[PDB]
Amino acid sequence: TCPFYKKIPGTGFTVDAFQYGVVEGCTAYFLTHFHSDHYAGLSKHFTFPVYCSEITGNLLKNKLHVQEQYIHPLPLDTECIVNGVKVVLLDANHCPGAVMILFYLPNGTVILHTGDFRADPSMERSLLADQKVHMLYLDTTYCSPEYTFPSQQEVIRFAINTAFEAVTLNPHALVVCGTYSIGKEKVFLAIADVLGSKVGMSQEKYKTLQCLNIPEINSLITTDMCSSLVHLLPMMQINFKGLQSHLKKCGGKYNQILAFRPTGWTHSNKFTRIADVIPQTKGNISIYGIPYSEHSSYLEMKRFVQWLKPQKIIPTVNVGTWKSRSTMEKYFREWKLEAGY
Ligand code: NI
């Protein structure tokens, strides 16, 4: 059964609720982004209307084979009417095609669902500036002050300079990047670009990347592994066994692997600066874990909320424990008292 925090009251609508069967009274299913915890339950047999971005609709059609007739793509930053209710989609600064949804209820309430997001000051000059939001359904993934990480710009800078140095010292080194869902594409794209190579990958991953409307993509990626010196692999293979094995297959083209695991947050953020990060090494294989996040830091989240000044906040992440729920409610109150709303 569908939880309350996936329901938009006063409407026929749910959000990211595809794993509950037929939801009683839901007449349109919104999907915020193509990550499996959120799409769970969609397939080619789904027969109700789905509303989402263009990119999210490309993946629905090509990867889960949902029939065209039920996919309803919407443009961003545009007032649209759905079953008599005004809605707007906004960039969530998460993975490709990830949106926030504004619902303008018939009775005058305004609701913002962030879906998954990385808060940014640039959202303060979206169509959010123009009016008041009563309810915020918030991605509270890193809602605790210990969650700090660098900007995405600093992390990419670290990865580019690391890879460029290594390969210029040893032209026979191969660079490998771990992946398991969409998002974080900039990690492997920016590395390839500085190395003058295309990114090589399996057919299934190539297909996935072909749905994301990235400009000049055909110039950046390929299925011919032999022609590329940056290879993508499944995240589970980004370990010393997985990498030695993969090196066998390259057939004596390369004598060194430099690999990157893009994670979210890890406790080595409590002590270490991005500049100071070092790999784990075994023989001719080094692995760097790098804190490239697509969720709000605690401070980025706080700023966004204190700008928005919502009347009520409903968390969508970390909701299954009382300790979490209680901790989050305390920060909400602090933030409200500090800013004075
Ligand atoms: Ni996500």
CSV table of C-alpha atoms and ligand atoms in Angstrom, one decimal:
chain,number,residue,atom,x,y,z
A,1,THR,CA,0.0,0.0,0.0
A,2,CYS,CA,1.1,3.5,-1.0
A,3,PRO,CA,2.5,5.7,1.9
A,4,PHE,CA,1.1,9.1,2.6
A,5,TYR,CA,4.3,11.0,1.6
A,6,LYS,CA,3.7,9.7,-2.1
A,7,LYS,CA,0.2,11.2,-2.3
A,8,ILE,CA,-0.7,14.7,-3.5
A,9,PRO,CA,-3.9,15.4,-1.5
A,10,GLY,CA,-6.6,17.3,-3.2
A,11,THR,CA,-5.6,15.7,-6.5
A,12,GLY,CA,-5.8,12.4,-8.4
A,13,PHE,CA,-1.9,12.3,-8.3
A,14,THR,CA,0.9,10.2,-6.9
A,15,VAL,CA,4.7,10.6,-7.2
A,16,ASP,CA,7.2,7.8,-7.6
A,17,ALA,CA,4.6,5.2,-6.6
A,18,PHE,CA,4.8,2.3,-9.1
A,19,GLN,CA,5.3,-0.7,-6.7
A,20,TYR,CA,1.9,-0.7,-4.9
A,21,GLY,CA,-0.3,-2.0,-7.7
A,22,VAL,CA,-3.4,0.0,-8.7
A,23,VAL,CA,-3.4,3.0,-6.3
A,24,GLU,CA,-7.1,3.6,-5.3
A,25,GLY,CA,-8.1,6.9,-6.9
A,26,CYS,CA,-4.8,7.8,-8.6
A,27,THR,CA,-5.6,9.0,-12.1
A,28,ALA,CA,-2.0,10.0,-13.1
A,29,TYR,CA,1.4,8.7,-11.9
A,30,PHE,CA,4.2,11.2,-11.9
A,31,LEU,CA,7.8,9.9,-12.2
A,32,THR,CA,10.5,12.3,-11.0
A,33,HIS,CA,13.6,10.6,-12.4
A,34,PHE,CA,14.8,7.1,-13.8
A,35,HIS,CA,16.4,5.6,-10.7
A,36,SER,CA,15.1,2.1,-9.8
A,37,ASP,CA,14.0,2.8,-6.2
A,38,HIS,CA,11.7,5.4,-7.8
A,39,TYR,CA,10.6,3.6,-11.0
A,40,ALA,CA,10.2,0.2,-9.2
A,41,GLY,CA,7.2,-1.6,-10.8
A,42,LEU,CA,7.0,0.0,-14.2
A,43,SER,CA,7.2,-2.3,-17.3
A,44,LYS,CA,5.7,-2.7,-20.8
A,45,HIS,CA,2.4,-3.8,-19.3
A,46,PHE,CA,1.7,-0.6,-17.4
A,47,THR,CA,-1.6,0.9,-18.7
A,48,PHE,CA,-2.1,4.2,-16.8
A,49,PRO,CA,-0.8,7.6,-17.8
A,50,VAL,CA,2.7,8.5,-16.7
A,51,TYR,CA,3.9,12.1,-16.5
A,52,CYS,CA,7.7,12.9,-16.6
A,53,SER,CA,10.4,14.8,-18.5
A,54,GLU,CA,11.3,14.1,-22.1
A,55,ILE,CA,14.5,12.3,-21.0
A,56,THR,CA,12.7,10.2,-18.5
A,57,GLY,CA,10.3,9.3,-21.3
A,58,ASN,CA,13.1,8.3,-23.6
A,59,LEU,CA,14.3,5.8,-21.0
A,60,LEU,CA,10.9,4.5,-20.2
A,61,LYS,CA,10.3,3.7,-23.9
A,62,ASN,CA,13.7,2.3,-24.7
A,63,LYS,CA,14.8,0.6,-21.5
A,64,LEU,CA,11.6,-0.7,-19.8
A,65,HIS,CA,9.6,-0.8,-23.0
A,66,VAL,CA,6.6,1.1,-21.7
A,67,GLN,CA,4.1,1.7,-24.6
A,68,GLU,CA,4.2,5.2,-26.1
A,69,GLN,CA,0.5,5.8,-25.6
A,70,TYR,CA,0.9,6.0,-21.8
A,71,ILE,CA,4.1,8.1,-21.7
A,72,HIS,CA,3.3,11.8,-21.4
A,73,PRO,CA,6.5,13.9,-21.6
A,74,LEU,CA,6.3,17.6,-20.4
A,75,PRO,CA,8.7,20.5,-21.1
A,76,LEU,CA,10.5,22.2,-18.2
A,77,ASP,CA,9.8,25.6,-16.9
A,78,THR,CA,6.4,25.6,-18.5
A,79,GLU,CA,2.9,25.9,-17.0
A,80,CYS,CA,1.0,22.8,-18.1
A,81,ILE,CA,-2.6,21.6,-17.3
A,82,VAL,CA,-3.0,17.9,-16.2
A,83,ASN,CA,-6.5,16.5,-15.4
A,84,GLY,CA,-7.5,20.1,-14.6
A,85,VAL,CA,-4.6,21.0,-12.4
A,86,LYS,CA,-1.8,23.4,-13.2
A,87,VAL,CA,1.7,21.9,-12.9
A,88,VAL,CA,5.3,22.9,-13.6
A,89,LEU,CA,8.5,20.8,-13.9
A,90,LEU,CA,11.8,22.2,-12.9
A,91,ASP,CA,15.4,20.9,-13.1
A,92,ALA,CA,16.3,19.0,-9.9
A,93,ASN,CA,20.2,19.1,-10.5
A,94,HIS,CA,20.3,15.4,-9.8
A,95,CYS,CA,20.8,12.9,-12.8
A,96,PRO,CA,19.7,13.5,-16.4
A,97,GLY,CA,16.0,14.2,-16.8
A,98,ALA,CA,15.5,14.5,-13.0
A,99,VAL,CA,12.7,17.0,-12.1
A,100,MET,CA,11.0,18.8,-9.1
A,101,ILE,CA,7.2,19.1,-9.5
A,102,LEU,CA,5.1,22.3,-8.6
A,103,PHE,CA,1.4,21.6,-8.1
A,104,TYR,CA,-1.1,24.5,-8.0
A,105,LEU,CA,-4.1,23.0,-6.2
A,106,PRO,CA,-7.7,24.1,-7.0
A,107,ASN,CA,-8.3,25.3,-3.4
A,108,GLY,CA,-5.3,27.7,-3.5
A,109,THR,CA,-2.6,25.5,-1.9
A,110,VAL,CA,0.8,25.3,-3.6
A,111,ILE,CA,3.0,22.1,-3.2
A,112,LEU,CA,6.6,21.6,-4.3
A,113,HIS,CA,7.9,17.9,-4.5
A,114,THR,CA,11.7,18.0,-4.9
A,115,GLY,CA,12.0,14.5,-6.1
A,116,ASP,CA,15.7,13.7,-5.6
A,117,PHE,CA,17.7,17.0,-5.7
A,118,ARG,CA,21.0,18.9,-5.2
A,119,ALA,CA,19.9,22.3,-3.9
A,120,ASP,CA,21.5,25.2,-5.7
A,121,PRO,CA,21.3,29.0,-5.4
A,122,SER,CA,20.3,29.0,-9.1
A,123,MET,CA,16.9,27.6,-8.0
A,124,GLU,CA,16.2,30.9,-6.3
A,125,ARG,CA,15.7,32.4,-9.8
A,126,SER,CA,13.4,29.7,-11.2
A,127,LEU,CA,9.6,30.1,-11.4
A,128,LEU,CA,9.8,29.3,-7.6
A,129,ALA,CA,10.6,33.0,-7.0
A,130,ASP,CA,7.1,34.2,-8.0
A,131,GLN,CA,4.8,32.7,-5.2
A,132,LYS,CA,4.4,31.1,-2.0
A,133,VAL,CA,4.7,27.4,-1.3
A,134,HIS,CA,2.6,25.8,1.5
A,135,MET,CA,4.0,22.3,1.5
A,136,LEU,CA,7.5,21.0,0.7
A,137,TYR,CA,8.1,17.3,0.1
A,138,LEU,CA,11.8,17.2,0.7
A,139,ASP,CA,14.7,15.0,-0.3
A,140,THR,CA,16.2,14.7,3.1
A,141,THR,CA,19.0,12.1,2.1
A,142,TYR,CA,21.9,14.1,3.8
A,143,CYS,CA,19.9,16.1,6.4
A,144,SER,CA,22.5,16.1,9.2
A,145,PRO,CA,25.4,18.5,9.7
A,146,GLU,CA,28.1,15.9,9.4
A,147,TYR,CA,27.3,15.6,5.7
A,148,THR,CA,29.7,17.9,4.0
A,149,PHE,CA,31.2,17.4,0.5
A,150,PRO,CA,32.9,19.6,-2.1
A,151,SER,CA,31.3,21.2,-5.1
A,152,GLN,CA,31.0,19.0,-8.2
A,153,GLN,CA,33.4,21.5,-10.0
A,154,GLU,CA,36.3,20.7,-7.4
A,155,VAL,CA,35.8,17.0,-7.7
A,156,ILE,CA,35.9,17.0,-11.5
A,157,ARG,CA,39.0,19.2,-11.3
A,158,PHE,CA,40.6,16.6,-9.0
A,159,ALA,CA,39.7,13.7,-11.4
A,160,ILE,CA,40.9,15.4,-14.6
A,161,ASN,CA,44.3,16.4,-13.1
A,162,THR,CA,44.8,12.9,-11.6
A,163,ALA,CA,44.1,11.0,-14.8
A,164,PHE,CA,46.0,13.5,-17.0
A,165,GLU,CA,49.1,13.2,-14.8
A,166,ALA,CA,49.0,9.4,-14.6
A,167,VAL,CA,48.6,8.7,-18.3
A,168,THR,CA,51.1,11.4,-19.4
A,169,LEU,CA,53.7,9.6,-17.1
A,170,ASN,CA,52.6,6.2,-18.5
A,171,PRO,CA,51.0,6.1,-22.0
A,172,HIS,CA,50.2,2.5,-21.4
A,173,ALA,CA,47.9,3.1,-18.4
A,174,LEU,CA,44.1,2.5,-18.7
A,175,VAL,CA,41.5,4.5,-16.9
A,176,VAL,CA,38.4,2.8,-15.6
A,177,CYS,CA,35.2,4.4,-14.2
A,178,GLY,CA,32.5,2.6,-12.2
A,179,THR,CA,28.7,3.1,-12.9
A,180,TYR,CA,25.4,1.5,-12.0
A,181,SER,CA,22.6,3.8,-12.8
A,182,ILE,CA,22.4,7.1,-14.7
A,183,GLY,CA,23.8,10.3,-13.2
A,184,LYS,CA,27.5,11.3,-12.7
A,185,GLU,CA,28.2,11.2,-16.4
A,186,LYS,CA,30.5,14.2,-16.1
A,187,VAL,CA,33.1,12.1,-14.2
A,188,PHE,CA,33.9,9.8,-17.2
A,189,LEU,CA,33.2,12.5,-19.9
A,190,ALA,CA,35.6,15.1,-18.5
A,191,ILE,CA,38.4,12.5,-18.0
A,192,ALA,CA,38.0,11.2,-21.7
A,193,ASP,CA,38.0,14.7,-23.0
A,194,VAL,CA,41.3,15.7,-21.3
A,195,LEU,CA,42.9,12.4,-22.5
A,196,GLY,CA,41.6,12.9,-26.2
A,197,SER,CA,39.7,9.6,-26.1
A,198,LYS,CA,36.1,8.4,-26.4
A,199,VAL,CA,34.6,6.5,-23.5
A,200,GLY,CA,34.2,2.8,-24.1
A,201,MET,CA,31.4,0.7,-22.7
A,202,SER,CA,29.0,-2.2,-23.1
A,203,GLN,CA,26.1,-2.2,-25.5
A,204,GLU,CA,23.5,-1.9,-22.7
A,205,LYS,CA,25.2,1.2,-21.2
A,206,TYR,CA,25.7,2.8,-24.6
A,207,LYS,CA,21.9,2.4,-25.2
A,208,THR,CA,21.2,4.1,-21.9
A,209,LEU,CA,23.5,7.0,-22.7
A,210,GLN,CA,21.9,7.4,-26.2
A,211,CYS,CA,18.5,8.4,-24.5
A,212,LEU,CA,19.9,11.4,-22.5
A,213,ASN,CA,20.0,14.2,-25.2
A,214,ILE,CA,23.6,15.0,-24.4
A,215,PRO,CA,24.8,17.3,-27.2
A,216,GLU,CA,27.6,15.9,-29.5
A,217,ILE,CA,27.3,12.4,-27.7
A,218,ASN,CA,28.2,10.4,-30.8
A,219,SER,CA,31.6,12.2,-30.6
A,220,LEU,CA,32.1,11.1,-26.9
A,221,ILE,CA,31.1,7.5,-26.5
A,222,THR,CA,31.5,4.1,-28.3
A,223,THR,CA,31.1,0.3,-28.0
A,224,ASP,CA,34.5,-0.4,-29.5
A,225,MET,CA,36.5,-1.0,-26.4
A,226,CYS,CA,39.8,-1.5,-28.3
A,227,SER,CA,39.8,2.1,-29.6
A,228,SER,CA,39.2,3.9,-26.2
A,229,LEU,CA,41.5,4.5,-23.2
A,230,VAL,CA,38.7,5.2,-20.8
A,231,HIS,CA,36.4,2.2,-20.0
A,232,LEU,CA,33.2,2.1,-18.0
A,233,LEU,CA,32.3,-1.0,-16.0
A,234,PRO,CA,29.7,-2.0,-13.4
A,235,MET,CA,30.4,-0.5,-10.0
A,236,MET,CA,30.7,-4.0,-8.4
A,237,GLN,CA,33.7,-4.7,-10.6
A,238,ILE,CA,35.6,-1.7,-9.2
A,239,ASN,CA,37.9,-3.8,-6.9
A,240,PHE,CA,41.3,-5.4,-7.3
A,241,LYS,CA,40.1,-8.8,-8.6
A,242,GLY,CA,37.6,-7.2,-11.0
A,243,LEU,CA,40.2,-4.9,-12.4
A,244,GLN,CA,43.0,-7.5,-12.8
A,245,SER,CA,40.6,-9.7,-14.7
A,246,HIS,CA,39.5,-6.8,-17.0
A,247,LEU,CA,43.2,-6.0,-17.6
A,248,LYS,CA,43.7,-9.6,-18.9
A,249,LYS,CA,41.1,-9.0,-21.6
A,250,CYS,CA,42.9,-5.9,-23.0
A,251,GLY,CA,45.5,-8.3,-24.3
A,252,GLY,CA,48.8,-6.6,-23.3
A,253,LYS,CA,47.8,-3.1,-24.6
A,254,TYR,CA,48.0,-1.8,-21.0
A,255,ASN,CA,50.2,-2.4,-18.0
A,256,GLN,CA,48.5,-0.2,-15.4
A,257,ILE,CA,44.9,0.6,-14.2
A,258,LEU,CA,43.8,3.8,-12.6
A,259,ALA,CA,40.1,3.4,-11.5
A,260,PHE,CA,37.5,5.8,-10.0
A,261,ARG,CA,34.5,4.9,-7.8
A,262,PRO,CA,32.2,7.9,-7.6
A,263,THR,CA,30.3,7.5,-4.3
A,264,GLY,CA,28.0,9.8,-2.3
A,265,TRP,CA,29.3,10.7,1.1
A,266,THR,CA,31.9,8.7,3.0
A,267,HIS,CA,33.3,9.3,6.6
A,268,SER,CA,36.7,10.2,5.1
A,269,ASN,CA,35.0,13.6,4.3
A,270,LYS,CA,35.0,14.2,8.1
A,271,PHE,CA,38.8,14.4,8.1
A,272,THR,CA,40.2,14.8,4.6
A,273,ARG,CA,40.0,17.7,2.0
A,274,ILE,CA,39.5,16.9,-1.7
A,275,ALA,CA,43.0,18.0,-2.5
A,276,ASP,CA,44.3,15.5,0.1
A,277,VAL,CA,42.6,12.3,-1.3
A,278,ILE,CA,44.8,9.2,-2.0
A,279,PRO,CA,44.0,5.9,-3.6
A,280,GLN,CA,44.1,2.3,-2.5
A,281,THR,CA,46.8,0.5,-4.4
A,282,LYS,CA,47.8,-3.2,-5.1
A,283,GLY,CA,50.5,-3.7,-7.7
A,284,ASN,CA,49.9,-1.9,-10.9
A,285,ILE,CA,46.2,-1.0,-9.9
A,286,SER,CA,45.0,2.1,-8.0
A,287,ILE,CA,41.4,2.9,-7.0
A,288,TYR,CA,40.2,6.4,-6.0
A,289,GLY,CA,36.8,6.8,-4.2
A,290,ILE,CA,35.6,10.3,-5.0
A,291,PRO,CA,32.7,12.2,-3.3
A,292,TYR,CA,30.8,13.3,-6.3
A,293,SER,CA,27.3,13.9,-4.9
A,294,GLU,CA,24.0,14.4,-6.7
A,295,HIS,CA,22.1,15.1,-3.4
A,296,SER,CA,22.1,18.3,-1.3
A,297,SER,CA,24.8,18.8,1.3
A,298,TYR,CA,23.3,19.7,4.8
A,299,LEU,CA,24.3,23.4,4.2
A,300,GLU,CA,22.9,23.5,0.6
A,301,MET,CA,19.6,22.0,1.8
A,302,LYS,CA,19.3,24.5,4.8
A,303,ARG,CA,19.9,27.4,2.5
A,304,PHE,CA,17.2,26.3,0.1
A,305,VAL,CA,14.6,25.7,2.7
A,306,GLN,CA,15.4,29.0,4.6
A,307,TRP,CA,14.9,30.8,1.2
A,308,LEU,CA,11.7,29.1,0.4
A,309,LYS,CA,10.1,29.4,3.8
A,310,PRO,CA,7.5,26.7,3.5
A,311,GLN,CA,4.7,26.4,6.0
A,312,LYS,CA,5.0,22.6,6.4
A,313,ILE,CA,7.8,20.1,5.5
A,314,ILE,CA,7.2,16.4,4.7
A,315,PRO,CA,10.5,14.4,4.4
A,316,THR,CA,10.7,11.7,1.6
A,317,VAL,CA,14.0,10.0,2.6
A,318,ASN,CA,15.2,8.5,5.9
A,319,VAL,CA,11.6,8.2,7.1
A,320,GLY,CA,11.7,4.6,8.4
A,321,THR,CA,13.2,5.2,11.9
A,322,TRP,CA,12.0,7.3,14.8
A,323,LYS,CA,15.5,8.5,15.5
A,324,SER,CA,15.8,9.9,11.9
A,325,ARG,CA,12.3,11.4,12.0
A,326,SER,CA,13.1,13.1,15.3
A,327,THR,CA,16.5,14.5,14.2
A,328,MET,CA,15.0,15.9,11.0
A,329,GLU,CA,12.1,17.7,12.8
A,330,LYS,CA,14.7,19.3,15.2
A,331,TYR,CA,16.6,20.8,12.2
A,332,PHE,CA,13.4,22.0,10.6
A,333,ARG,CA,12.5,23.9,13.8
A,334,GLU,CA,16.1,25.4,14.2
A,335,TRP,CA,16.1,26.6,10.6
A,336,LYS,CA,12.6,28.1,11.0
A,337,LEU,CA,13.6,29.9,14.3
A,338,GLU,CA,16.9,31.1,12.9
A,339,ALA,CA,15.3,32.6,9.7
A,340,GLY,CA,12.1,33.8,11.6
A,341,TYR,CA,9.3,32.3,9.4
B,1,NI,NI,17.9,9.3,-7.3
